[PDB]
Design a protein around this nucleic acid. Sequence first.
DNA 1: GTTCAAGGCCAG
DNA 2: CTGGCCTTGAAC
Length: 95
Amino acid sequence: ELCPVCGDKVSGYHYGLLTCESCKGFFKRTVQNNKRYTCIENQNCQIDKTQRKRCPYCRFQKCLSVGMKLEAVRADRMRGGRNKFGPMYKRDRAL
DNA sequence: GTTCAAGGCCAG
DNA sequence: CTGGCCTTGAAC
Ligand SMILES: [Zn+2]
Ligand SMILES: [Zn+2]
């Protein structure tokens, strides 16, 4: 399937839904360090595989827009296991 | 024992 | 900063 954010190849469920590996890394990086970006355009830049790197601000807005969850990023940076969205993913897979 | 989604590593 | 690959571990 295609990443709902940039269209790249999905690698699995990441923070609420299927996304590509790069967007998973980007969202993690962003939320973990409270990164704050600023768009030089009009905060409505188009995101695609070849432009996602051009504006992190709009890339992040899209991540939130499509449904990526801030709560899936762990405050205590705990490793492994499975979060509260475990069952949800199991349901999304079936349907 | 196996899954597999979340965190970590690091070459570029 | 980016993103492909690695490590971790509760849930099943
Ligand atoms: Zn993506
Ligand atoms: Zn923008």
